[PDB]
Amino acid sequence: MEAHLANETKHALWHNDHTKGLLHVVIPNAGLIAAGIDPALLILKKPGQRFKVEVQTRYHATGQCEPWCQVFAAYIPDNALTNLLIPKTEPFVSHVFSATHNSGGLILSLPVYLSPGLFFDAFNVVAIRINTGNRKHRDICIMYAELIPNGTRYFADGQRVLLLCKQLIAYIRCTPRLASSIKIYAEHMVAAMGESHTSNGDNIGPVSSIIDLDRQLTSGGIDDSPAETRIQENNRDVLELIKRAVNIVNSLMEWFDICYAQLVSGDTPADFWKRRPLSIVPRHYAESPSPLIVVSYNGSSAWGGRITGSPILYHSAQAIIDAACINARVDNPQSLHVTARQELVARLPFLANVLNNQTPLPAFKPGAEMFLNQVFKQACVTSLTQGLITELQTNPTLQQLMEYDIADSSQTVIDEIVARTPDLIQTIVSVLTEMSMDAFYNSSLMYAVLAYLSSVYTRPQGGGYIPYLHASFPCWLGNRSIYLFDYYNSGGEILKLSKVPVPVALEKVGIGNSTQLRGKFIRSADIVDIGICSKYLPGQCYAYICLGFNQQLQSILVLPGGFAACFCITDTLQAALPASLIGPILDRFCFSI
Amino acid sequence: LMGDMAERTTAILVSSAPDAGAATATTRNMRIYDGALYHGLIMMAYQA
């Protein structure tokens, strides 16, 4: 609550560009149980990772994208509700109030669009980037309908403050200290709230005051709308006239604030807004039982605030569409009349880019990146296996050619692997329909392939392709420095063995004639979690198979046994996959300064 | 009794997780492979 408040000055200083309105959104941490990660490494533990969260938009057949947003936040464990609701009293912490097992919380920035032409629909999905493991990141994807539900909770917040104030008054009165002036002024203030409410009723009435969320997050969604206010005022006028007819024919916290400042002697950001009514905008879902509570400032003319009059309602954008749809009893606007299309274009300027049928795309699928990358990886792996099998079929010479450091007593089994090349390639071909597809869908190979295509088609309008931070650092100018080796066993069955590839140095000795390969190593003084598989000798029950790739999509076989094939698949990908399949890729993965 | 009868027994495999008393990140990675049969029939004797 402190970092966000400190960062709010950037949004406060903004005067122009009203299309990005920052607001406070609280995301419950109930879904973190299924994350399967360590919560200790998510707030403050071993600094250096520099975890960041980015927010980006996703358009549909229009082009362009938002240039991300540099925001960050931190979690808070151990009953965050207790320390965010009750004012901070760490020097004099005691048994104050009563609550059940609470949870944590987080604050996320989500820009909103405010303008005379407000409009509202559900066609945009907000993408959230998390700097964690790409394997089962456990992310969420929602449309714009949940972002703006057009509702607020203004009446339910009144009773919440009453329980807290009664509890604090009881706590103050329970200790016999200070002087009788505080007691007498508290009694006078209590009596001033009602004549028969206290003298003939009760002063405090603890009865069953238990801090719980039962009637706060259930009802009160649409209660202060202008139509509801008109109905309420009409009902109150009717009641007033009925009372008048029946009669005609029968047959103020200044002292409290001063005392609180004197006693607590400490302020928290969650106390200044308690004097004014708040707004709650929950948006729950069946995925996890946790409402998405949203708090909006009351002292500013932001979304949901009520300080000068009617707030933003996001209206005048649905009745016209409904009338157009019901005019011809056809839901699809594409098969409507010319007059309806003209009216829709005139009323909605942003809808004119869909009728002209520009930037064609199959249907409207914002979440196409997953299977698009899956198809690209499958095509690349099939091209690679076709190239390797063709080079193996057209491989000249036989057995070993160069020296190779092989022990005399261990060379009797080295040739066995080489003699089983048809079996190995058959197993590789057959494993494409047996191995799981969730193990190679977020590896470094797809990222390197995507970064390789960044050189071609550098935006329709241009761009220097200069990222700020947290980008493809290993793939900046060339892939010949960092290699990716995958270790697989031999025989009639091939399965994944390693977890993360480790680069292996390689050099050529001979500068002509029969080239020789001799791997080397580079001493690193920045990490110690390095496997010993790369440093293993070629002997000791043979070795693995390595197939490196450069920045030009050139693969060099490093299979032991004097066999080495060099094939390029840079032109096979373009032939099989045209340039019309990189639409969303260019729309999303692009940035300029 | 013969009017109402069951069909067969089903087997469900479950897992286990260690206690959350340790804050080490390695405690959330390991997982001991163990379980028990669902509605199984085990006899405490044998027939010669």
Q: Does B25 touch chain A (CB under 8 A)?
A: yes
Helix, strand, coil share (%) of chain A residues, nearest 5: 35, 5, 60
Q: Does B24 touch chain A (CB under 8 A)?
A: yes
DSSP string across A378-404: HHHHHHHHHHHHHHHHT--S-S--S--
Residues near A266 by beta carbon (within 8 Å), at least 6 away in sequence: A87, A88, A89, A91
SS3 label, residue A203: coil
User: How far out from the chain centre does Cα A429 lie?
Assistant: 37
The Cα-based distances of A561 to A484, A507, A537 in angstroms read: 21, 18, 15
- A111 and A20 Cβ atoms separated by less than 8 Å: yes
Residue A40 and residue B28: Cβ atoms within 8 Å?
A: no
Backbone angles phi and psi of A517, in degrees to 5: -115, 130
- The Cα A233–Cα A261 span in angstroms is 39
Q: Which candidate in A32, A38, A135, A499 is best for mutational testing of the B interface (most B CBs within 10 A)?
A: A38
Q: Which residues of B touch A38 (CB under 8 A)?
A: 23-25, 27-28
User: Which residue in chain A has the smallest CA separation from B27?
Assistant: A38
A510 residue type, one letter:
G
User: How far out from the chain centre does Cα A373 lie?
Assistant: 19
Structure tokens at A376: 């690209």
Structure tokens at A92: 């004099």
Residue corresponding to tokens 């947290």:
A470
- The Cα B18–Cα B29 span in angstroms is 10
User: Kind and range of the H or E element at A517?
Assistant: strand A516-517
- A552 and A448 Cβ atoms separated by less than 8 Å: no
Residue B25 and residue A36: Cβ atoms within 8 Å?
A: no
- The Cα A482–Cα A503 span in angstroms is 6
Q: Which residues of B touch A40 (CB under 8 A)?
A: 23, 25
CA contacts within 13 A on the Cβ side of A464: 4
Backbone angles phi and psi of A167, in degrees to 5: -65, -45
Shortest distance, CA B28 to any CA of chain A (angstroms):
7
- The Cα A137–Cα A58 span in angstroms is 19
What's the alpha-carbon Rg for chain B, to the nearest Å? 19
Q: Does B30 touch chain A (CB under 8 A)?
A: no
Residue B28 and residue A37: Cβ atoms within 8 Å?
A: yes
- The Cα A228–Cα A153 span in angstroms is 13
- A294 and A282 Cβ atoms separated by less than 8 Å: yes
Counting Cβ atoms within 10 Å, is residue A294 exposed (0-12), middle (13-18) or buried (19+)? buried
CB atoms within 10 A of CB A582: 17
Residue A41 and residue B25: Cβ atoms within 8 Å?
A: yes
The Cα-based distances of A412 to A420, A421, A560, A561 in angstroms read: 14, 17, 14, 12
Q: Which residues of B touch A78 (CB under 8 A)?
A: none
A336 residue type, one letter:
L
Q: Which residues of B touch A132 (CB under 8 A)?
A: none
- A150 and A278 Cβ atoms separated by less than 8 Å: no
What's the alpha-carbon Rg for chain A, to the nearest Å? 34
Pairing of strands A554-557, A508-509: unpaired
The Cα-based distances of A354 to A382, A588, B37 in angstroms read: 37, 19, 58
Residues near A483 by beta carbon (within 8 Å), at least 6 away in sequence: A503, A504, A506, A548, A549
Q: Which residues of B touch A41 (CB under 8 A)?
A: 25
CB atoms within 10 A of CB A22: 19
- The Cα A306–Cα A422 span in angstroms is 75
- The Cα A511–Cα A481 span in angstroms is 19
Output the CA torsion A86→A90→A94→A100 (10° steps).
40
- The Cα A233–Cα A386 span in angstroms is 77
In sequence order, the β-bridge partners of residue A509 are A516
Shortest distance, CA A46 to any CA of chain B (angstroms):
12
Long-range contacts of B34-43 (CB under 8 A, 24+ apart): B37/B11, B38/B9, B38/B10, B38/B11, B38/B12, B39/B9, B39/B10, B40/B9, B40/B11, B41/B9
Residue B28 and residue A38: Cβ atoms within 8 Å?
A: yes
Residues near A460 by beta carbon (within 8 Å), at least 6 away in sequence: none
The Cα-based distances of A414 to A143, A411, A487, A541, A591 in angstroms read: 58, 5, 16, 8, 50
- The Cα A558–Cα A484 span in angstroms is 12
Q: Which residues of A touch B24 (CB under 8 A)?
A: 38
Structure tokens at A412: 């009797």
Name the DSSP letter for residue A87.
P
- The Cα A440–Cα A499 span in angstroms is 11
Pairing of strands A25-28, A105-108: antiparallel
Q: Which residues of B touch A36 (CB under 8 A)?
A: 28
Q: Which residues of B touch A37 (CB under 8 A)?
A: 25, 28
Residue corresponding to tokens 């509702």:
A151
- A526 and A411 Cβ atoms separated by less than 8 Å: no
Q: Select from A184, A198, A189 the least CA-distant residue to A254.
A: A189
Q: Which residues of A touch B (CB under 8 A)?
A: 36-38, 40-41
Residue B23 and residue A40: Cβ atoms within 8 Å?
A: yes
- A100 and A81 Cβ atoms separated by less than 8 Å: no
Structure tokens at A549: 């790739």
Q: Select from A213, A222, A239 the least CA-distant residue to A101.
A: A213
- A347 and A119 Cβ atoms separated by less than 8 Å: no
| CB contact burial A384-408 (16+ within 10 A = b; e otherwise) | beebbbebbeeeeeeebeeeeebee
User: Kind and range of the H or E element at A227?
Assistant: helix A226-248
Counting Cβ atoms within 10 Å, is residue A209 exposed (0-12), middle (13-18) or buried (19+)? middle
The Cα-based distances of A148 to A144, A573, B37 in angstroms read: 6, 43, 49
Structure tokens at A229: 């206010």
The Cα-based distances of A278 to A157, A273, A302, A307, B37 in angstroms read: 7, 7, 13, 11, 53
Residue B23 and residue A38: Cβ atoms within 8 Å?
A: yes
- A585 and A375 Cβ atoms separated by less than 8 Å: no
Backbone angles phi and psi of A175, in degrees to 5: -90, 120
Size of interface A-B (CB pairs under 8 A): 11
Name the DSSP letter for residue A39.
G
Q: Select from A213, A199, A93 the least CA-distant residue to A163.
A: A213
CA angle in degrees (0–180, nearest 5) for A390-A392-A395: 110
Q: Does B28 touch chain A (CB under 8 A)?
A: yes
Name the DSSP letter for residue A199.
T
- The Cα B45–Cα A451 span in angstroms is 67
Residue corresponding to tokens 């274009």:
A345
Structure tokens at A400: 């070993």
SS3 label, residue A11: helix
Q: Which residues of A touch B18 (CB under 8 A)?
A: none
- The Cα A378–Cα A375 span in angstroms is 5
